[PDB]
Amino acid sequence: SEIQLMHNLGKHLNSMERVEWLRKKLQDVHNFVAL
């Protein structure tokens, strides 16, 4: 029970931990007038 069990760090981030990730991560930056 590991590797996939608790994968929030960066190597799991790439395609599925981006769309739903950046979705909640947009509230952490809210305005964000940059890149």
UniProtKB/Swiss-Prot annotation:
Residue ranges of the region described as Important for receptor binding: 18-35
Coiled coil: none
Subcellular location(s) per record: Secreted
Subunit structure: Interacts with PTH1R (via N-terminal extracellular domain).
Family the UniProt entry places it in: Belongs to the parathyroid hormone family.
Disease: Hypoparathyroidism, familial isolated, 1: A form of hypoparathyroidism, a disorder characterized by hypocalcemia and hyperphosphatemia due to a deficiency of parathyroid hormone. Clinical features include seizures, tetany and cramps. FIH1 inheritance can be autosomal dominant or recessive.
Known role: Parathyroid hormone elevates calcium level by dissolving the salts in bone and preventing their renal excretion. Acts by binding to its receptor, PTH1R, activating G protein-coupled receptor signaling. Stimulates [1-14C]-2-deoxy-D-glucose (2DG) transport and glycogen synthesis in osteoblastic cells.
Name of the protein in question: Parathyroid hormone
First-to-last residue of the parent protein present: 34 to 68 of 115
